[PDB]
Design an enzyme around this catalytic site. Structure first.
Site, PDB file in Angstrom:
ATOM      1  N   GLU A  21      30.909  36.447  40.292  1.00 53.61           N
ATOM      2  CA  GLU A  21      29.947  36.689  41.339  1.00 53.61           C
ATOM      3  C   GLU A  21      29.090  35.436  41.485  1.00 53.61           C
ATOM      4  O   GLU A  21      28.390  35.079  40.561  1.00 53.61           O
ATOM      5  CB  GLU A  21      29.062  37.923  40.982  1.00 53.61           C
ATOM      6  CG  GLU A  21      29.984  39.166  41.194  1.00 53.61           C
ATOM      7  CD  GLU A  21      29.166  40.455  41.148  1.00 53.61           C
ATOM      8  OE1 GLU A  21      28.270  40.525  41.972  1.00 53.61           O
ATOM      9  OE2 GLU A  21      29.519  41.274  40.291  1.00 53.61           O
ATOM     10  N   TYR A  23      26.258  34.590  42.818  1.00 55.92           N
ATOM     11  CA  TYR A  23      24.856  34.586  42.506  1.00 55.92           C
ATOM     12  C   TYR A  23      24.567  34.695  41.009  1.00 55.92           C
ATOM     13  O   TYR A  23      23.493  34.275  40.578  1.00 55.92           O
ATOM     14  CB  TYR A  23      24.082  35.655  43.247  1.00 55.92           C
ATOM     15  CG  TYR A  23      24.120  37.060  42.691  1.00 55.92           C
ATOM     16  CD1 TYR A  23      25.127  37.953  42.939  1.00 55.92           C
ATOM     17  CD2 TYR A  23      23.036  37.476  41.881  1.00 55.92           C
ATOM     18  CE1 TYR A  23      25.119  39.241  42.412  1.00 55.92           C
ATOM     19  CE2 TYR A  23      23.022  38.760  41.368  1.00 55.92           C
ATOM     20  CZ  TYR A  23      24.053  39.625  41.641  1.00 55.92           C
ATOM     21  OH  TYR A  23      24.004  40.903  41.110  1.00 55.92           O
ATOM     22  N   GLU A 186      32.257  51.122  44.164  1.00 59.01           N
ATOM     23  CA  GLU A 186      31.751  50.995  45.510  1.00 59.01           C
ATOM     24  C   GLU A 186      32.727  50.926  46.652  1.00 59.01           C
ATOM     25  O   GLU A 186      32.731  49.982  47.447  1.00 59.01           O
ATOM     26  CB  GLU A 186      30.872  49.689  45.541  1.00 59.01           C
ATOM     27  CG  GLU A 186      29.607  49.857  44.707  1.00 59.01           C
ATOM     28  CD  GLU A 186      28.566  48.780  44.864  1.00 59.01           C
ATOM     29  OE1 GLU A 186      28.840  47.737  45.528  1.00 59.01           O
ATOM     30  OE2 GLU A 186      27.426  48.922  44.351  1.00 59.01           O
ATOM     31  N   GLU A 286      24.236  51.339  38.505  1.00 58.06           N
ATOM     32  CA  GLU A 286      23.696  50.046  38.844  1.00 58.06           C
ATOM     33  C   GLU A 286      22.317  50.244  39.507  1.00 58.06           C
ATOM     34  O   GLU A 286      22.091  51.184  40.254  1.00 58.06           O
ATOM     35  CB  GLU A 286      24.526  49.218  39.819  1.00 58.06           C
ATOM     36  CG  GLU A 286      25.920  48.857  39.326  1.00 58.06           C
ATOM     37  CD  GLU A 286      26.657  47.964  40.316  1.00 58.06           C
ATOM     38  OE1 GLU A 286      26.022  47.407  41.238  1.00 58.06           O
ATOM     39  OE2 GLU A 286      27.867  47.862  40.146  1.00 58.06           O
TER      40      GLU A 286
END
Length: 394
Positions: A21, A23, A186, A286
């Site tokens: 990921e 970020y 998700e 999360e």
């Protein structure tokens, strides 16, 4: 290995490890930047591995996998009072589509992690975070901006990958460690065919049980309203050991970001009230401390932040620069963060527990359990409250 009625999950996600990921580990992506031009930076792991080629991708990932999370992190997690970790993993760790650029080798570390969990009395969920074709078009699925999980044979390939995960990690070998296999992280409900998604969940449930496994099946809520899954996979239909994973954040839209701190807290409390009404065990798989979307590339490579009016047509709220470093945060932002964390902890402990995203980031403080704990913003011990009873749960 866990009592979902009587125990409370207090955990962290081991994000950024087996699924890159941007970020979370911007250092692996930044070398592709040309000055201030981010147009050539790979936007996801699919493109990052394709750009590097198999040899360089594997060399760089082996170093990442071997150092990002090690046994010492598991000892630290335990020492901080946590009892659980969620481990995201992509389908490519077990099977490649023809022409996939991804490299393998993650399984070796996953198995090391299960032993580290066992050693430190930590329980685990294995989460299939990315499915072939992408189930949400997010970069955390491996492939950004593609929504083809229900196209072609992508669903069947996902089921075949789940069968491998079921046979390896849903049996007696890890029954003292693995307390849930999450079928798919998700799935983006609004763009998918929900009937086919339910069928996929049912197929995964049945396949797991058919192997003799008693491991809890974790289904992510697919961004549906609270209570949506109440009548699915129920004890009345002989379906059992089912957990609903809800992810909760208040930073991915202009409306959510503009809430004052009291409203942010009221929403957090309401998550607790509404989850209590659901009929399935449920865990906040999360959540974070973020009250902004300022972390570089959180919205994706080459995308700015809504917080400073630089993405998604959102209005400017504040400058992100000052919020990038936790030592530059004002006293009010620190207080707001602590209040926000505590309200979420109370709401999530009101049901099955919580799993913070994530254990560590390279330099995004709002998303790092370690950083927040070390700066005194995440309660330690985790039951400590500077702002007791903000929600008034009964």
């Amino acid at each position: 290995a866990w009592d979902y009625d009587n125990n409370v999950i207090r955990g962290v996600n081991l994000g950024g490890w087996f699924v890159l990921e941007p970020y979370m580990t911007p250092s692996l992506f930044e070398p592709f930047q040309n000055g201030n031009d981010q147009s050539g930076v790979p936007v996801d792991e699919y493109h990052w591995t394709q750009t590097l080629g198999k040899e360089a991708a594997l060399r760089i990932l082996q170093k990442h996998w071997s150092t990002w999370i090690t046994e010492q992190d598991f000892k630290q997690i335990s020492n901080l009072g946590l009892n659980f970790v969620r481990i995201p993993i992509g389908y490519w760790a077990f099977q490649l589509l023809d022409n996939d650029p991804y490299v393998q080798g993650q399984v070796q570390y996953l198995e090391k992690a299960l032993g580290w969990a066992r050693k430190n009395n930590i329980r685990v969920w294995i989460d299939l975070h990315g499915a072939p074709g992408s189930q949400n078009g997010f970069d955390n699925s491996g492939l950004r901006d593609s929504y083809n999980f229900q196209n072609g044979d992508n669903t069947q390939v996902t089921l075949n990958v789940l069968n491998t995960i079921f046979k390896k990690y849903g049996g007696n070998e890890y029954s003292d460690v693995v307390i849930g296999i999450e079928l798919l992280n998700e799935p983006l409900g609004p763009v998918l065919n929900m009937d086919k998604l339910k069928q996929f969940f049912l197929d995964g449930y049945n396949s797991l049980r058919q192997t003799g496994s008693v491991t809890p099946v974790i289904i992510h809520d697919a961004f549906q309203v609270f209570g949506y899954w109440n009548n699915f996979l129920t004890v009345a239909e002989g379906q059992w050991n089912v957990v609903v994973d809800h992810h909760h954040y208040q930073v991915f839209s202009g409306g959510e970001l503009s809430r004052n701190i009291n409203d942010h807290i009221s929403v957090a409390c309401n998550w607790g009230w509404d989850a209590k009404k659901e009929s399935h065990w449920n865990v906040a798989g999360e959540w974070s401390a973020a009250l902004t979307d300022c972390a570089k590339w959180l919205n994706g490579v080459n995308r700015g932040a809504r917080y400073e009016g630089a993405y998604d047509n959102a209005p400017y709220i504040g400058s992100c620069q000052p919020l990038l470093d936790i030592s530059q945060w004002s006293d009010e932002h620190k207080t707001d963060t602590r209040r926000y964390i505590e309200a979420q902890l109370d709401a999530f402990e009101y049901t099955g527990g919580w799993v913070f995203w994530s254990w560590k980031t390279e330099n995004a403080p709002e998303w790092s359990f370690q950083t927040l704990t070390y700066n005194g913003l995440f309660p330690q011990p985790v039951t400590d409250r500077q702002f007791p009873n903000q929600c008034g749960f009964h």
